[PDB]
Write a protein that binds this ligand. Structure first.
Ligand SMILES: Nc1ncnc2c1ncn2[C@@H]1O[C@H](COP(=O)(O)OP(=O)(O)O)[C@@H](O)[C@H]1O
Lengths: 43, 51
């Protein structure tokens, strides 16, 4: 996912974190390796 | 002094990503489990099997 910083502008404080956590947990459950590039906080 | 924190106490393992906070907490928990007591680990960023 290149870059996960793009979604910072288009979203509120908690909604962006919720979206990123949703994707992280989805890839985790399906077992996929998850590379995340960012331009770093609790992330 | 005295050899440990007070029992009914609060401890704050402040740090940054990569410091080892979770591992120090897990060591606290392992002490509790090895001495016959029960301990709880509330993870908010890690699966239990992953931990
Ligand atoms: N076998 C090992 N030898 C040396 N260091 C290790 C080993 N396993 C893990 N670590 C260290 O543990 C750290 C992770 O600690 P962690 O409990 O995840 O801290 P936090 O959760 O606060 O980021 C890493 O920085 C890594 O260097």
């Amino acid at each position: 996912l290149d870059p996960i910083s793009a979604f910072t502008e288009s979203g509120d404080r908690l909604e962006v974190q919720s979206m990123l956590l949703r994707i992280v947990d989805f890839l985790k459950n399906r077992g996929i390796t998850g590379i995340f590039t960012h331009l770093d906080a609790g992330l | 002094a005295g050899g440990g924190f007070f029992r009914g106490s609060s401890i704050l393992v402040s740090g940054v990503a990569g410091a080892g906070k979770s591992s120090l907490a897990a060591h606290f928990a392992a002490a509790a489990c090895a001495r016959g007591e029960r301990a709880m680990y509330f993870s908010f960023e890690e699966a239990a099997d992953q931990a």
